[PDB]
Design a protein around this ligand. Structure first.
Ligand SMILES: CCCCCCCCCCCCCCCCI
Length: 132
């Protein structure tokens, strides 16, 4: 559901401010988040990946390192309105994307790659929202 992807995006972004008084980042990132679900948009700023990883770690979906906590990621989805089957589809995609993106000590760059892959698969389902 697009409606459910919108609420998940909004709620994922609530932790963002805060991250900011904790990593201190820029208007390039706000532009990337604003554009995230636009078709064909490409994220080019490394520090957007840092933001996503900060966000996810604050929500307990990433560990110290960047392996997804599947259980906590399911719980986030369900918290913000995914039913069991949508949540399980989402986790599978993120897990597929971790497997497919190359190892990188640079976790900010690793995150961008996973997050690109994720966005792509969400478009393929027609679940990318108009953040409107
Ligand atoms: C399973 C829940 C996803 C919820 C919100 C999506 C918004 C954008 C962040 C998702 C991309 C994840 C990228 C790196 C893996 C850490 I979950």
């Amino acid at each position: 559901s697009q409606e459910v992807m919108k609420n998940l995006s909004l709620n994922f972004g609530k932790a963002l401010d805060e991250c900011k008084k904790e990593m201190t980042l820029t208007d390039a990132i706000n532009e990337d988040f604003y554009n995230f679900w636009k078709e064909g948009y490409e994220i080019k700023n490394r520090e957007t990946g840092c933001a996503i990883m900060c966000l996810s770690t604050k929500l307990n979906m990433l560990d110290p390192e960047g392996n997804l906590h599947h259980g906590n990621a399911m719980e986030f989805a369900k918290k913000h309105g995914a039913d069991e089957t949508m949540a399980q589809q989402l986790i599978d995609i993120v897990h597929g994307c971790e497997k497919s993106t190359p190892a990188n000590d640079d976790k900010c760059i690793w995150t961008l790659g996973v997050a690109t892959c994720f966005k792509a698969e969400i478009h393929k389902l027609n679940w990318a929202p108009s953040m409107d």
